[PDB]
Ligand binder design. Sequence first.
Ligand SMILES: OC[C@H]1O[C@@H](O)[C@H](O)[C@@H](O)[C@@H]1O
Length: 357
Amino acid sequence: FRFIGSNNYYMHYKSNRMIDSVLESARDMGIKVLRIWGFLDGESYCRDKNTYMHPEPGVFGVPEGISNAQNGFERLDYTIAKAKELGIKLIIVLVNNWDDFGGMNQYVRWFGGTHHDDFYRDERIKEEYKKYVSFLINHVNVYTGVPYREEPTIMAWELANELRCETDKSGNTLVEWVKEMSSYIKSLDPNHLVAVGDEGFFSNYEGFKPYGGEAEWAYNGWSGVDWKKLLSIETVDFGTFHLYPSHWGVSPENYAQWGAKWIEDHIKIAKEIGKPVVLEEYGIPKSAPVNRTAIYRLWNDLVYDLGGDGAMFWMLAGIGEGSDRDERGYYPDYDGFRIVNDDSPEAELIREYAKLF
Ligand SMILES: OC[C@H]1O[C@@H](O)[C@H](O)[C@@H](O)[C@@H]1O
């Protein structure tokens, strides 16, 4: 199974109209897999979206006594049931490295820690993450009757979006945490694939250096991620990597070749370990002084020709509503990476490549 995929982060708190639009757009475009968030941590983040998943330790869903709120499990249930109908598979990520939707720092605040990376080390935090993930994976979808652990529309669980641990540049903290949590998920759900959801950083591997000497930190272990070691974990089924040369220090004239080398290196390493590998987020800003579609074509050709298992752009949006609606009625392009199902050269490229993979 090889595919063109995408990402959408608002499938657990927006309306039926808006969810139907993203999933219908994916089906129309040929996008087979959508990577979505399965978390909403912290009372302030829940209140901001009027949607509750994990507002406090041991509270899953809407707090007793709060009325007029959405339950993010019910919105995720609706998303899964519609994806099932429309033939879209879902990768569902279980916490954010970043503060959007609470993330690791929200868990550290709950447990009175002092650094983001206490999330990997404090046993009280690790226990709360396992309680959350157990609740989610055992949750019975209210539109299908099928618990998520038995739902084939879900392709994979992912431990943590873009996990990093800068406080341990040896890589060992993340290896231990990924071993513990991926084994834990397999103990709950022996059916589904498990992956990490990280960006794919290397930790000073002989003969792997960045294109053009830019963004060395992504090759030399700065983030505390040793991707090869993570991919070798028995309870990890496939490797994930992300690609944003414009965020990482690469010059615009080097975005294409830096990204090309990044894809080549990840596929070579995963092929030697013998597990599948997915480029699960990539993006070039709409305003970059290069042809974004030709970069996306180059990177999709490389994944296709080198035998990578999937290429997933960040990100796909559909129609918008309320305060999230732009000049054409769509959910707005807030970050410069949005693609929608229109006549843009990027949308045309995605439709063309979805026919190939
Ligand atoms: O904070 C810097 C990092 O921020 C994240 O939001 C992005 O996804 C990364 O690409 C970036 O390196």
